[PDB]
Every structure is written in C-alpha cells, then in structure tokens.
Amino acid sequence: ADLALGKQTFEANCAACHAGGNNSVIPDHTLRKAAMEQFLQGGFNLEAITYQVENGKGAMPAWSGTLDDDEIAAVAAYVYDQASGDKW
Numbered sequence: 001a002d003l004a005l006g007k008q009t010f011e012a013n014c015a016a017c018h019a020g021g022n023n024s025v026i027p028d029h030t031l032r033k034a035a036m037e038q039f040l041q042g043g044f045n046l047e048a049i050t051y052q053v054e055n056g057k058g059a060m061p062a063w064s065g066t067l068d069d070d071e072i073a074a075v076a077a078y079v080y081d082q083a084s085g086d087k088w
C-alpha cells in the first residue's frame with residue numbers, strides 16, 4: 001500500500017473529524033483498534049474500513065464521489081496501519 005499517499009489523503013480529507021485518530025462528531029467511535037472492533041460494521045479489517053469510506057455511514061460521509069479507487073485504497077491502508085500499530 002502507498003502509505004505516503006494515504007497519510008496526505010487523510011490529513012486533507014479526514015482530519016477535521018478524526019484528528020489524532022479520534023472523532024469530533026461521535027466521540028467514542030474513534031479510529032483506535034479496540035473502538036473499531038466494537039463500532040465498525042464488519043470488525044477491524046481492510047474490507048470493513050474500505051466499505052465505510054466508499055459508502056459512508058450516518059454522520060460519516062461517503063467518499064466514492066470525491067476520492068478515486070487508488071486514493072480510497074491508500075487511506076484505508078493508512079487507517080488500518082495506524083490502528084494496528086497504535087500510531088495515533
């Protein structure tokens with residue numbers, strides 16, 4: 001995965017709501033591994049993350065009409081990497 005692209009895509013598009021890997025809209029639905037295991041539909045895995053970034057969920061906007069496939073893949077990988085290595 002192009003983690004470099006993923007990080008810049010993250011800062012540019014997701015940081016207002018998830019700065020520090022947290023969540024400013026619904027505080028407990030952070031991007032930490034344990035939180036995603038509880039709140040992310042499908043659990044903590046790349047497929048679940050990609051699905052939500054593409055399709056959206058409630059106050060979480062859908063990005064399929066803003067970011068392209070290679071950009072979505074990149075950002076999903078970055079989020080997974082950050083969570084599993086707890087790099088936030």
Ligand code: HEM
Binds near residue numbers: 023035052
């Ligand atoms: C940017 C493109 C972006 C990413 C990446 C992203 C990811 C993401 C994940 C993986 C979750 C799940 C967290 C969990 O614990 O279940 C999640 C959830 C929400 N998001 Fe998000 N998100 C991105 C962008 C944005 C933006 C710009 C906003 C703010 C307007 C935002 C908000 C939210 C909200 C609210 C949720 C919770 C969804 C729900 O379960 O109801 N995200 N995001």
